[PDB]
Design goal:
The protein has 110 residues and is mostly helical. It has helices at residues 18-28, 32-35, 43-52, 56-71, 77-86, 90-97. It has one domain: Death Domain, Fas (Orthogonal Bundle). The chain has 6 helices and no strands. α1 (18-28) packs across α4 and α3 packs across α4. The termini are far apart. It is classed as transport protein. The entry lists the keywords death domain, structural genomics, nuclear matrix, RIKEN Structural Genomics/Proteomics Initiative, rsgi, transport protein.
């Protein structure tokens, strides 16, 4: 194939969108219940989402959505990541943030 991957270089600048949400959800998984108490949601909601959808992915999405429709344009990934951290979801944070594994570029040192 090939390794190109087009697109601009922007991060933690705009509020997550359906494009990211869906993605996030998958990442979230069952952690939607760990980010719920960290997203400043309502207990009822948690109980709702759970009912709304049985699957985890869905439940996660539903949350992200509500969390997205909650904060509004303030629904950024960096803000979510921050929570993930304290939420002890370093995985997600690291995932979203996605800095690198071993080598990325490192433009000289100094």
């Amino acid at each position: 194939g090939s390794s190109g991957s087009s697109g601009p270089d922007v991060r933690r600048d705009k509020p997550v969108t359906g494009e990211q949400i869906e993605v996030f959800a998958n990442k979230l998984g069952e952690q939607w219940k760990i980010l719920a108490p960290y997203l400043e949601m309502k207990d009822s909601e948690i109980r709702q989402i759970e009912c709304d959808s049985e699957d985890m992915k869905m439940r996660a999405k539903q949350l992200l959505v509500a969390w997205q429709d909650q904060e509004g344009v303030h629904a950024t990934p960096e803000n979510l990541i921050n929570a993930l951290n304290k939420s002890g979801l370093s995985d997600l944070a690291e995932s979203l943030t996605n800095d690198n594994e071993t080598n990325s570029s490192g433009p000289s040192s100094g």
